[PDB]
Amino acid sequence: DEQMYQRCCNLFEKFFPSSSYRRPVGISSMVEAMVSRARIDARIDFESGRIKKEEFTEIMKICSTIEELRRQK
């Protein structure tokens, strides 16, 4: 059950795969680094037309929800 941590690692890679060159800021927590990449990616994908408005909106709202859960307790 060092799997609490293997699961976060696994998820983290989905934001920063070994073969990205946009590397996360070192002094950042895993959570803010991921959200922050999720935002920059939602903007890019929405420009390129990879995702639509509804899809863009939801991702953005999940991100503000995540930020609240960091900025408390």
């Binding site: 939801e58 999940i62 995540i66 859960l69």
Partner: peptide, 13 residues
């Protein structure tokens, strides 16, 4: 992009 942010929301839960 949707699967990954929904699993983050979960892990943060």
């Amino acid at each position: 992009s949707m699967e990954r942010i929904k699993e983050l929301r979960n892990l943060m839960s």
